[PDB]
Design a protein around this ligand. Structure first.
Ligand code: ET
Length: 165
């Protein structure tokens, strides 16, 4: 499968985080969460705030300690803002395997994701389960079947994988 290696320094993310029972339940409600965020003007507001560290809006899947799964819609933002209403988190530095989904959101993303999970099955010692993974949505028309969504999966010690020697 095609992917690019990218690295990120520590980042501050601003947005809204919701929590669901598990991965399956999250998929049922994520589309709704996005719909609610757009309708209430949250997306527009968050878009004003990105300092440009990452281009776009992020949809992060965050594992919770009790087995629950959280989803956060956010942008990379500056710490120096009052920022009372929004949820804020620090995304720890990491290296990632970055994949692309070409197509209309979100079906193109879901199908690409099933594929990604299957592919990373072979990199069990390198993937980081407790670490957040995310979809990055750049400016553009989601509807177009030429639209590209980036999927960022965090990894550790990937250089040591035998397939790379
Ligand atoms: C809920 C559909 N929807 C929309 C969307 C589509 C049409 C109008 C408004 C939002 C969306 C729009 C942007 N920019 C970025 C991500 C998503 C998204 C992501 C996941 C999902 N599961 C549904 C999603």
């Amino acid at each position: 499968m095609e992917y690019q290696l990218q690295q990120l320094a520590s980042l501050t993310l601003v947005g809204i985080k919701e929590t669901y029972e598990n991965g399956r339940q999250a998929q049922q409600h994520i589309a709704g969460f996005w719909q609610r965020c757009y309708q209430e003007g949250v997306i527009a507001d968050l878009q004003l705030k990105n300092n440009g560290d990452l281009a776009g809006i992020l949809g992060l899947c965050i594992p919770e300690l009790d087995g629950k799964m959280s989803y956060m819609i956010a942008v990379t933002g500056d710490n120096s803002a009052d920022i009372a209403k929004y949820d804020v988190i620090t995304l720890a530095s990491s290296k990632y395997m970055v994949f692309e989904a070409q197509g209309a959101v979100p079906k193109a993303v879901q199908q690409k994701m099933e594929e990604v999970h299957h592919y990373i099955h072979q990199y069990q010692a390198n993937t980081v389960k407790s670490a957040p993974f995310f979809e990055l949505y750049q400016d553009g028309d989601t509807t177009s079947e030429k639209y590209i969504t980036e999927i960022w999966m965090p990894v550790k010690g990937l250089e040591h994988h035998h397939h790379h020697h």
